[PDB]
């Protein structure tokens, strides 16, 4: 079990989304909390977590239960640049919005326009690396 | 058989090759798209941390609100500073007659009271210095008129919105023979009136001219009387929605009665020029005048449905006003 | 409408009455200095002078007054101010009608920071509730 | 006769290669798609399927008919054993290996042939695993 240093980081960002001091967190913001430390879960990693931790149907999570999940899942910035450059055709480290837009809306974690539209505003042909400076 | 069979092999490899290339693509995309949900997600957090900090910085500021300025109450203090100056700008007083000022934050009472005084003097200077001298004359004229009449005469109120003006009577109507006789005196105001004689109390149209020296009562061109301001003591009027007045004046003709269709105007304008402003009477009962010499007469006012002036065999002058 | 009224007479007669009592002369920049120092600022002669010129009307003194106020509000060094506050509560608000809940708000000050303890600050919240809180009500009370 | 689970998966890839997104895809596309969904069709079967639906020479194919094709081909697919048997007749001496020369040879000539680009891709994929040559037994099961 990791030294206290994480635990401090862990409790504050556990609490900060705890609605009114109870020690319980809604389902919807278990993701954001994790994200709020440096992670990158998917909705697959989430749902698998959710049912296993609680099948109560409560829609809550106390801090022991959240502690445990963390140890389990404990990737750098390069694991991102590969995951992006596969779509690049040129091999110049550029992809273009047209290309990127259609993919995201039809692949595994499909986005609605809202999420996607933020992408289009985000930068610039867009640049593969440019986003990563922002990305991380 | 070998050719048929060989195809199966190649068939499988392509399927394997594209399929694995596809999965690689699907995987590589679920990586970034949801790793990015955790970029945006990690800001939803850090802005909800700032929000908590700001609330608390404010309340920490409040608890320390009696302290000299410092980083902690700097927020809170600047908030009351800010809030105040805004919430005043919204609620500033409409004019010189708005006493009203809003209640301030305890600390800035001292400032509130500086500002209120400053605003008022600003308002005073802004107004007095921007008024056009034309207009300044009108209000000044109107203002004396209210002083004289407001409350005391049943048609002063209706008079207010209809402006006062220079001469009521014509470029040409004054008849050159009278102007020559009139002399080196100018005409500050003229207006058509109706005279009623001492004995008969009969109607006679005339013109009333106001010169710096005197009032002059003029027939078509014959100048039938001059009353000096020294020789004119007072004016008397009824208290009803009437239109008529008497000029008090001292073996020569004396007081006289007249009707202006523009009564408030004429009467103030006169009393100003003649400096007999304080010397106007407003009677609710009856008016006494010296009359045509040796023939004293009395004027009896009464309310009614119409305007008419007539005499009745008491010898008195019976006036009947309308009534709004 | 748009006609002379007895009110206007009143306004004229009063305004000139005041004009006499007050100086014939125009407004002073050393007057202005007093007002800001009152508000906890301390600017130089150079800064005072500059300000008056950026508020003007045709008249003798005749400072634009509303936009004068607004000019000081900039000088605060905390421009964010009301904008910053209006936000921060909204992030702790589910329905965007201006309300917040007391356990929620209680959590914020007690737990995360340095253990801020209320005194009167507790008193205010219980007053704001009719139930839960209203920020608009909470802040207007706290600035008073 | 068709599972809901299946339609969901297939729709994804179709729509992914449906760049214009009209509800239909390039005939030349069609190969890459069925294989990306994990099948093993042959340009033999492609042409039969393409010719029949694209009777009218559109050069286009919608998703309703696409489900028939995946379903028709789903009816029968090659087990590992037959594929294992398939290599075995190119392996005269029953050691269970295959020179990557003989491999390159057999592939680039006999059947629905493969380029060098393709064949290099398959030899790397069918890795020598040391300087070696290509045991098919490990590899065939691998492609499943």
Curated annotation (Swiss-Prot), chain A:
- Keyword Transferase appears in the UniProt entry: no
Cross-referenced Pfam families, in alphabetical order? EF-hand_7 (PF13499)
Domain EF-hand residue range list: 5-40, 41-74, 75-110, 111-136
Which Gene Ontology molecular function entries are recorded, alphabetically?
calcium ion binding; signaling receptor binding
User: Which amino acids does the record list as binding Ca(2+) 3?
Assistant: 88, 90, 92, 94, 99
Briefly state the protein's biological role: Calmodulin acts as part of a calcium signal transduction pathway by mediating the control of a large number of enzymes, ion channels, aquaporins and other proteins through calcium-binding. Calcium-binding is required for the activation of calmodulin. Among the enzymes to be stimulated by the calmodulin-calcium complex are a number of protein kinases, such as myosin light-chain kinases and calmodulin-dependent protein kinase type II (CaMK2), and phosphatases.
Name this protein carries in UniProt: Calmodulin-1
Q: What is the protein's species of origin?
A: Xenopus laevis (African clawed frog)
Lineage per the UniProt record:
Eukaryota, Metazoa, Chordata, Craniata, Vertebrata
From Swiss-Prot, chain B:
The induction comment states: Up-regulated by serum.
Q: Which residues form the TH1 domain?
A: 153-323
Q: Which residues carry this modification: Phosphoserine?
A: 132, 305
Q: Which domain of life is it from?
A: Eukaryota
How does it get modified post-translation?
A: Isoform 2 contains a N-acetylmethionine at position 1.
- Give its localization: Cytoplasm; Nucleus; Cytoplasm, Cell cortex; Cell projection, Stereocilium membrane
* Residue ranges of every copy of the IQ domain listed in the record: 2-25, 26-54
UniProt tissue specificity: Isoform 3 is expressed in small intestine, pancreas, brain, kidney, skin, heart muscle, testis, striated muscle, spleen, liver and lung (at protein level). Expressed in brain, testis, adrenal glands, thymus, spleen, kidney, lung, heart, cochlea and vestibule. Expressed in sensory hair cells of the inner ear. Expressed in adipocytes.
Q: How does it assemble?
A: Interacts (via its IQ motifs) with CABP1 and CIB1; the interaction with CABP1 and CIB1 is calcium-dependent. Interacts (via tail domain) with PLEKHB1 (via PH domain); the interaction is not affected by the presence or absence of calcium and CALM. Interacts with POLR1A. Interacts with POLR2A. Component of the B-WICH complex, at least composed of SMARCA5/SNF2H, BAZ1B/WSTF, SF3B1, DEK, MYO1C, ERCC6, MYBBP1A and DDX21. Interacts (via its IQ motifs) with CALM; this precludes interaction with YWHAB. Interacts with YWHAB; this precludes interaction with CALM. Interacts with RPS6.
What does the UniProt record say this protein does? Myosins are actin-based motor molecules with ATPase activity. Unconventional myosins serve in intracellular movements. Their highly divergent tails bind to membranous compartments, which then are moved relative to actin filaments. Involved in glucose transporter recycling in response to insulin by regulating movement of intracellular GLUT4-containing vesicles to the plasma membrane. Component of the hair cell's (the sensory cells of the inner ear) adaptation-motor complex. Acts as a mediator of adaptation of mechanoelectrical transduction in stereocilia of vestibular hair cells.
Its UniProt domain note says: Binds directly to large unilamellar vesicles (LUVs) containing phosphatidylinositol 4,5-bisphosphate (PIP2) or inositol 1,4,5-trisphosphate (InsP3). The PIP2-binding site corresponds to the myosin tail domain (PH-like) present in its tail domain.
Q: Which family does it belong to?
A: Belongs to the TRAFAC class myosin-kinesin ATPase superfamily. Myosin family.
Q: What is this protein called?
A: Unconventional myosin-Ic
Q: Which organism is it from?
A: Mus musculus (Mouse)
């Amino acid at each position: 079990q990791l030294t206290e240093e994480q635990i401090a980081e862990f409790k504050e960002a556990f609490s900060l989304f705890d609605k009114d001091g109870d020690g319980t967190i809604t389902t919807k913001e278990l993701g954001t909390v994790m994200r709020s430390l440096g992670q990158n879960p998917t909705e697959a990693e989430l749902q698998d977590m959710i049912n296993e931790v609680d099948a109560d149907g409560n829609g809550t999570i106390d801090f022991p239960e959240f502690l445990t999940m963390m140890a389990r899942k404990m990737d750098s910035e390069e694991e991102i640049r590969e995951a992006f450059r596969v779509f690049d055709k040129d091999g110049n480290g550029y992809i273009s919005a047209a290309e990127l837009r259609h993919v995201m809306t039809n692949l595994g974690e499909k986005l609605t326009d809202e999420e996607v539209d933020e992408m289009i505003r985000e930068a610039d042909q867009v640049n593969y690396e440019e986003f990563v400076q922002m990305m991380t | 058989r070998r050719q048929s069979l060989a195809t199966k092999i190649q068939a499988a490899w392509r399927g394997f090759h594209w399929r694995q290339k596809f999965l690689r693509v699907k995987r590589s995309a679920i990586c970034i798209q949801s790793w990015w949900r955790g970029t945006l997600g990690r800001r939803k957090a850090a802005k909800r941390k700032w929000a908590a900090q700001t609330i608390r910085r404010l309340i920490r500021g409040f608890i320390l609100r009696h302290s000299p300025r410092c980083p902690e109450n700097a927020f809170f203090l600047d908030h009351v500073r800010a809030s105040f100056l805004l919430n005043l700008r919204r609620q500033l007083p409409r004019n010189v007659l708005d006493t009203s000022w809003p209640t301030p934050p305890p600390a800035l009472r001292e400032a509130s009271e500086l500002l209120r005084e400053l605003c008022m003097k600003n308002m005073v200077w802004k107004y007095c210095r921007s008024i056009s001298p034309e207009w300044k004359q009108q209000l000044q004229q109107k203002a004396v008129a209210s002083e004289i009449f407001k409350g005391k005469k049943d048609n002063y109120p209706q008079s207010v919105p209809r402006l006062f003006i220079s001469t009521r009577l014509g470029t040409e109507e004054i008849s050159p023979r009278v102007l020559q006789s009139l002399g080196s005196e100018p005409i500050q105001y003229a207006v058509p009136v109706v005279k009623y004689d001492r004995k008969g109390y009969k109607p006679r149209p005339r013109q009333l001219l106001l010169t710096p020296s005197a009032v002059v009562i003029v027939e078509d061109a014959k100048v039938k009387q001059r009353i000096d301001y020294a020789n004119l003591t007072g004016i008397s009027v009824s208290s009803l929605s009437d239109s008529l007045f008497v000029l008090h004046v001292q073996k020569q003709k004396g007081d006289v009665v007249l009707q202006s269709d523009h009564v408030i105007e004429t009467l103030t304008k006169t009393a100003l020029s003649a400096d007999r402003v304080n010397n106007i009477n407003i009677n609710q009962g009856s008016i006494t005048f010296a009359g045509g010499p040796g023939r004293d007469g009395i004027i009896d006012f009464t309310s009614g449905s119409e305007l008419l002036i007539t005499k009745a065999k008491n010898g008195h002058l019976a006036v009947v006003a309308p009534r709004l």
